[PDB]
Ligand binder design. Structure first.
Ligand SMILES: *Nc1ccc2c(C)cc(=O)oc2c1
Ligand SMILES: [Zn+2]
Length: 267
């Protein structure tokens, strides 16, 4: 795979429709905890233990504690130079009639905070709720999301369950509903929104340049998206930290934190 920034920049100058697939490394560069890899725990659990329908069914208080913590932590977090380069790229290109879309697996909204408008959040958002009775999706930035969760969700091992009664967990405020809310995020074992995937397929079909940032391209989610772009002859450029491996039938690979390489690539 080429690591020629100048060659990349020649494609970038001429590209009219860029798809940017954003993975977990973009969030990790802002210090956002993911509770996934080695060492990444909340109390005695990882995300694969708590971000499941079964976990929520059996202990909705514990799952709400986990997502309440993740909401509140964001008050100490900021977009990084990678987020900023991506947003500035969209803004500048949009005034030229050129399209930039960000397809992200990240749920912490830092792309939005940085100014990205054309955003597909394929795993949902920490700052949206979904009613488990009526299905309504709502924005929710309230600190705390409900009074019973104030001071709850502490991450330290040994912290006891809050065991909030389900009636005091976040509830739907649509007139005549009152159901129990869940976080509007995709759980392990769940389907991605087909309408989201409808929009993703349209962007992949039409783009003339594809970036994979903060993730590997040979793994989910980018492995679902990049192959068919590359198969069309569209250049695929990967920006990530792991020394290729990932092995790439793709055009470019730039090693390093994306906050180091993207400001230059997307200038
Ligand atoms: N079921 C499942 C859920 C989530 C995954 C992520 C976030 C990454 C992955 O590589 O494979 C997953 C599989
Ligand atoms: Zn409802």
């Amino acid at each position: 795979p080429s690591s020629s920034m100048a060659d990349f920049r020649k494609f970038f100058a001429k590209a009219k429709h860029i798809v940017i697939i954003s993975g977990a490394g973009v969030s990790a560069e802002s210090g956002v905890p993911t509770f996934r890899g080695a060492g990444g725990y909340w109390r005695k659990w990882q995300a694969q233990d708590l971000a499941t329908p079964l976990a929520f069914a059996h202990n909705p208080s514990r799952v709400w504690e986990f997502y309440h913590y993740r909401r509140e932590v964001m008050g100490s977090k900021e977009p990084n130079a990678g987020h900023r380069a991506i947003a500035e790229c969209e803004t500048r290109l949009g005034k030229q009639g050129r399209r930039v879309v960000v397809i992200t697996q990240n749920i912490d909204e830092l792309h939005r905070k940085a100014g990205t408008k054309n955003l597909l959040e394929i795993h949902g958002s920490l700052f949206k709720t979904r009613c488990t009775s009526c299905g309504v999706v709502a924005e929710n930035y309230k600190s705390p999301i409900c009074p019973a969760l104030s001071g709850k969700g502490a991450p330290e091992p040994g912290t006891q369950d809050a065991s909030i009664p389900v009636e005091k967990l976040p509830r739907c405020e649509e007139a005549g509903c009152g159901g129990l809310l869940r976080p509007h995020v995709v759980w392990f074992g769940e389907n991605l929104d087909p309408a989201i995937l409808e929009e993703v397929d349209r962007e992949l079909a039409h783009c003339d340049l594809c970036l994979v940032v903060g993730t590997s391209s040979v793994v989910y989610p980018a492995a679902m998206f990049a192959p068919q772009v590359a198969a069309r002859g569209v250049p695929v450029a990967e920006f990530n930290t792991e020394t290729t491996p990932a092995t790439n039938r793709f055009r470019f690979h730039f090693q390093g934190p994306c906050g180091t390489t993207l400001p230059e690539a997307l200038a």
